Design a protein around this motif. Structure first.
Motif, PDB file in Angstrom:
ATOM      1  N   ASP A 191       0.820  -1.223   0.000  1.00 52.88           N
ATOM      2  CA  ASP A 191       0.000   0.000   0.000  1.00 52.88           C
ATOM      3  C   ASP A 191       0.851   1.270   0.000  1.00 52.88           C
ATOM      4  O   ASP A 191       0.553   2.207  -0.766  1.00 52.88           O
ATOM      5  N   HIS A 229      -7.483  -4.570   0.680  1.00 52.88           N
ATOM      6  CA  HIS A 229      -8.140  -3.871  -0.479  1.00 52.88           C
ATOM      7  C   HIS A 229      -7.068  -3.821  -1.540  1.00 52.88           C
ATOM      8  O   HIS A 229      -5.878  -4.045  -1.240  1.00 52.88           O
ATOM      9  N   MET A 259      -5.790  -1.346  -5.173  1.00 50.67           N
ATOM     10  CA  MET A 259      -5.131  -0.018  -5.390  1.00 50.67           C
ATOM     11  C   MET A 259      -5.449   0.348  -6.821  1.00 50.67           C
ATOM     12  O   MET A 259      -5.310  -0.486  -7.731  1.00 50.67           O
ATOM     13  N   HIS A 308      -7.310   4.130  -3.085  1.00 53.70           N
ATOM     14  CA  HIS A 308      -8.347   3.085  -2.979  1.00 53.70           C
ATOM     15  C   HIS A 308      -9.412   3.670  -2.040  1.00 53.70           C
ATOM     16  O   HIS A 308      -9.205   4.703  -1.411  1.00 53.70           O
TER      17      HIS A 308
HETATM   18 ZN   LIG Z   1      -3.736   3.038   1.356  1.00 55.32          ZN
END
Ligand SMILES: [Zn+2]
Ligand SMILES: *[C@@H]1O[C@H](CO)[C@@H](O[C@@H]2O[C@H](CO)[C@@H](O[C@@H]3O[C@H](CO[C@H]4O[C@H](CO)[C@@H](O)[C@H](O[C@H]5O[C@H](CO)[C@@H](O)[C@H](O)[C@@H]5O[C@H]5O[C@H](CO)[C@@H](O)[C@H](O)[C@@H]5O)[C@@H]4O)[C@@H](O)[C@H](O[C@H]4O[C@H](CO)[C@@H](O)[C@H](O)[C@@H]4O[C@H]4O[C@H](CO)[C@@H](O)[C@H](O)[C@@H]4O)[C@@H]3O)[C@H](O)[C@H]2NC(C)=O)[C@H](O)[C@H]1NC(C)=O
Ligand SMILES: CC(=O)N1CCC(c2ccc3ncc(CC(=O)N(C)Cc4ccc(Cl)c(Cl)c4)c(=O)n3c2)CC1
Ligand SMILES: [Ca+2]
Ligand SMILES: [Ca+2]
Ligand code: NA
Ligand code: NA
Length: 805
Positions: free
Chosen positions: A261, A309, A311, A420
């Motif tokens: 991330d 999650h 991206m 995201h």
């Molecule tokens: Zn992030």
């Protein structure tokens, strides 16, 4: 105040946090600036790095080193993870062939296979294939274990809501972590990424897995980590804890990585700079697996490799500004970025008006890259409304874009290239799941599933009873070799009445008319058989839905459809009908345009009436079984029964009529027939659960006819589309929707156009799982199939997402 002059000697990464003002030595002390004075010296050793080299083998133990290569390190549980490779001629775990783990192969004293959850932040699903050549350890986990092609996060697709969903099995609206930033008006307090308010337990609801375990006698600390503890020290800490005595050792462990991330935000999901962080996370997986192999735990532990999650590519130039839409931009507070949440800047400003804000944000610009909603109008599949921390006004932002209040917010903050948070059906937001170990299957691919399901599986892996949650326990049994959960179907609470002909036409005074007076013992017995259920096996393919609450309802049979008719809500709870691939679409005949017919099986007192619709100038009506799909002109009359009628705003009838006239037949053509179950939903308190009668906020004017907030349909066919829906021998295929029953089509910016250009797009947005409709109706579907119950639970959790590859 912290008395930091206590000591971490013998206490490094202790599992029980000690109470203030005593200084701490656990893995979160850095976050609270409360570590003892000698925490860095004792607990964050770095001397000589993280790897054994040939010259260090059999060294005299030096307690200053980060990790050890002395002969005693195995018994001390503190070798460098590559010790056996460098010093003892062993192979790296990644270099060994995979071999099926048929049974746990655990050291003496292990009561159960431990569970290690390895969480990767921002690990987009497609990294597993796209990065495979640079991630050999993760590739071995994936190929040898159980994996899904992707796992669906919850909305918003942000870190804290998803990691806490993983830990609790709850939607964000229920666990309370509804964003990375929140205001709670009851607390009058704010939760932020940076800062300490977020550490207060009052934000965090539900029961996370570490509390579920601890309550049930299974040792487990929290899954959080202070950011400054390097990953190599996190892995060595896990391995040291696994070397604890039996009565002291946890059974569940969590590793977290802030990568990929962190880099993804800087460089975009596929920036060339992303290869290195993927290599580094792979090397950390390999440290863990080599460490487990050292401890003889590599065929004992269950490992879950999971992301929060994905991206997306997002840059500063793709920002919409509310100051380009709103007069009063200074009177609002916006939570910005890949979603928007709006509330009044001051609760003392009584000129603040949500209606005017929504209208100023609705279809104002031709290519507008966000859409405003009142939260109750958001797609029900997002389950994002029933929490006081979720502002009434929401903006759904298009993938690749941001929303912000004013331009100065974006340059007095271009840096970033990824972000995201978008709708959780968006492909770039999907993330990863791999399970590897004795309790998972070997070399097995499973279909994509939602992260809310994992808490129950983790509880199954640990022998725990899950706390009440939003997973569907049993729907992921196909991931598991053993420890499956064998649910029973819920018991039906209300049994139906099966009324016969009990009323004469003249007993009704409903204000309805029908030109049906136009008048054979061959076909008279035939029509009687239809009313007693002779075609029911054609139109009710999977059994009648069970009603899971106390109510009064009737089963009504007809040639072309069957329904469960509620005497309390004055309309069907469900209407079921099958349309074969060969079905023909017909018109509503001219003489029948305004036809509504009393149903002589149902009392006038338990019927709707036409006069109410004539008088309610806002409200019209539709039918649940569509007259367009009648099997014959004679059967068509059944479609105009008052017991098939439902209240519909004229704007909604445009949607519904196109679905019924055009799209059902299209689906029957494409899918080789379809079975359709349709019905109303009442969810005026937007909690995702069926309303009781006393929660209904709107009725057809002057009547007791309740107005649905939504209409659903569940559209089922054979997965092997070579077989017709009504003669299917194997697994099923489903798609469903929950359409909002709105008095305008303001959600659809192109609604002035022909329905062929906007209705299906609306329906796709409001796609749903059968389980979502179950919660919203108190009905239980697919009670009578030839399939295993766990397979049916998987089917009920399926979401048709309408995304590409
Ligand atoms: Zn992030
Ligand atoms: C997803 O799965 C979850 C978990 O199963 C489902 O959520 C459950 O739904 C139930 C029904 O909505 C609900 O049961 C109610 O619980 C009340 C007791 O609640 C407390 O205790 C539990 C158990 O430990 C706890 O988990 C709760 O936690 C919530 O609240 C705290 C803080 O307030 C939060 O930190 C936490 O995040 C969580 O918040 C979420 O839920 C609450 C509601 O509880 C929401 O308001 C939040 O927005 C957020 O979503 C609590 O600490 C209990 O009091 C209820 O009983 C009332 O209602 C019944 C109706 O059956 C009535 O007969 C009773 O008399 C009683 O009414 C009285 O109170 C009313 C309100 O003041 C009043 O109007 C009346 O006149 C009466 O005086 C009820 O049994 C359960 O709490 C939640 N659990 C969780 C964790 O969310 C969720 O439905 C699933 N979602 C889907 C779509 O399927
Ligand atoms: C509920 C509870 O018991 N609390 C007591 C601890 C408290 C708390 C204190 C310290 C702390 N330091 C760092 C992080 C960052 C972090 O760990 N990550 C980003 C990963 C991560 C891993 C698992 C989950 Cl479930 C989440 Cl949401 C995030 C974090 O969040 N911290 C939190 C929160 C409330
Ligand atoms: Ca994240
Ligand atoms: Ca409700
Ligand atoms: Na009307
Ligand atoms: Na419109």
């Amino acid at each position: 105040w912290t008395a930091t002059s206590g000591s971490c000697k013998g206490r490094c990464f202790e599992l029980q946090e000690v109470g203030p003002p005593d200084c701490r030595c656990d893995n979160l002390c850095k976050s609270y600036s409360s570590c003892c004075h000698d925490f860095d010296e004792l607990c964050l050793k770095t001397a000589r790095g993280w790897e054994c080299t040939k010259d260090r083998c059999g060294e005299v133990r030096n307690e200053e080193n980060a990790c050890h290569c002395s002969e005693d390190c195995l018994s001390r549980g503190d070798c460098c993870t590559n010790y056996q490779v460098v010093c003892k001629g062993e192979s790296h775990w990644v270099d060994d062939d995979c071999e099926e783990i048929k049974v746990p192969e655990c050291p003496a004293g292990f009561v159960r296979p431990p569970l290690i959850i390895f969480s990767v932040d921002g690990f987009r699903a497609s990294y597993m294939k796209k990065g495979s050549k640079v991630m050999p350890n993760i590739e071995k986990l994936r190929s040898c274990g159980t994996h899904a092609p992707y796992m669906r996060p919850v909305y918003p697709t942000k870190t804290f809501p998803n990691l806490y969903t993983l830990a609790t099995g709850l939607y964000p609206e229920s666990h309370g972590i509804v964003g990375n930033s929140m205001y709670d008006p009851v607390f009058d307090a704010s939760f932020h990424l940076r800062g300490r308010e977020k550490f207060n337990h009052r934000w965090w609801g539900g029961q996370p897995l570490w509390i579920t375990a601890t309550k049930q006698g299974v040792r487990a600390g929290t899954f959080f980590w202070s950011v400054s503890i390097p990953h190599e020290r996190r892995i060595l800490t896990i391995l040291q804890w696994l070397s604890l005595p039996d009565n002291e050792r946890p059974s569940v462990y969590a590793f977290y990585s802030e990568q990929p991330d962190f880099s993804g935000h800087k460089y975009g999901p596929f920036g060339p700079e992303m290869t290195n962080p993927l290599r580094e996370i792979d090397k950390t997986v390999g440290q863990l697996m080599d460490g487990l192999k050292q401890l003889r735990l590599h065929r004992c532990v269950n490992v879950i490799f999971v992301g929060d999650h994905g991206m997306e590519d997002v840059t500063c130039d793709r920002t919409e500004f509310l100051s380009n839409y709103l007069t009063n931009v200074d009177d609002i507070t916006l939570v910005p970025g890949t979603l928007g949440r709006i509330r009044a800047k001051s609760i003392n400003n009584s000129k603040y008006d949500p209606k005017t804000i929504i209208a100023a944000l609705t279809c104002k610009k031709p290519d507008q890259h966000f859409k405003p909603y009142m939260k109750q109008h958001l797609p029900k599949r997002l389950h994002y409304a029933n929490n006081r921390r979720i502002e009434d006004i929401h903006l759904l932002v298009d993938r690749r874009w941001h929303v912000a209040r004013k331009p100065l917010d974006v340059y007095k903050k271009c840096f970033f290239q990824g972000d995201h948070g978008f709708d959780n059906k968006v492909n770039s937001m999907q993330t990863v799941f791999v399970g590897y170990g004795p309790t998972f299957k070997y070399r097995t691919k499973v279909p994509p599933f939602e992260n809310i399901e994992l808490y129950n599986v983790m509880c199954d892996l640990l022998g725990l009873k899950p706390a009440p949650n939003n997973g569907t326990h049993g729907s992921l049994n196909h991931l598991l070799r053993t420890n499956t959960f064998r649910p029973t179907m819920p018991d039906e609470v209300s049994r139906p009445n099966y009324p016969g002909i009990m009323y004469l036409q003249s007993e009704f005074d409903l204000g309805c008319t029908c030109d049906d007076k136009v008048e054979n013992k061959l076909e008279e017995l035939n029509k009687r058989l239809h009313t007693k259920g002779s075609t029911k096996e054609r139109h009710l393919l999977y059994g009648r839905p069970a009603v899971l609450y106390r109510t009064s309802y009737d089963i009504l049979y007809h040639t072309d459809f069957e329904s469960g008719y509620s005497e309390i809500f004055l309309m069907p709870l469900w209407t079921s009908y099958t349309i074969s691939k060969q079905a023909e679409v017909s018109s509503i005949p001219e003489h029948l345009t305004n036809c509504v017919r009393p149903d002589v099986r149902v009392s006038p007192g338990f019927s709707q009436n036409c006069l109410a619709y004539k008088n309610d100038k806002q409200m019209s009506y539709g039918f649940l079984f569509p007259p367009y799909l009648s099997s014959s002109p004679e059967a068509k009359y059944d479609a105009f029964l008052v017991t098939n009628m439902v209240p519909m705003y004229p704007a909604f009838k445009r949607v519904w009529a196109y679905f019924q006239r055009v799209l059902v037949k299209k689906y029957a053509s494409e899918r080789n027939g379809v079975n359709v179950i349709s019905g109303p939903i009442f969810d005026y308190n937007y909690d995702g659960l069926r309303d009781t009668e006393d929660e209904i906020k709107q009725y057809v004017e002057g009547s007791s006819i309740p107005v649905p907030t939504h209409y659903y349909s569940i559209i089922t066919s054979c997965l092997d589309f070579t077989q017709p829906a009504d003669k299917c021998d194997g697994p099923l295929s489903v798609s469903s929707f929950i359409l909002p029953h709105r008095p305008d089509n303001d959600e659809s910016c192109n609604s002035s156009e022909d329905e062929s250009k906007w209705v299906e797009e609306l329906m796709k947005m409001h796609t749903a799982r059968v389980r979502d409709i179950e919660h919203l109706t108190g009905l239980d579907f697919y009670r009578k199939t030839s399939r295993s119950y766990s397979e049916i639970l998987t089917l009920k959790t399926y979401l048709h997402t309408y995304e590409s590859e």
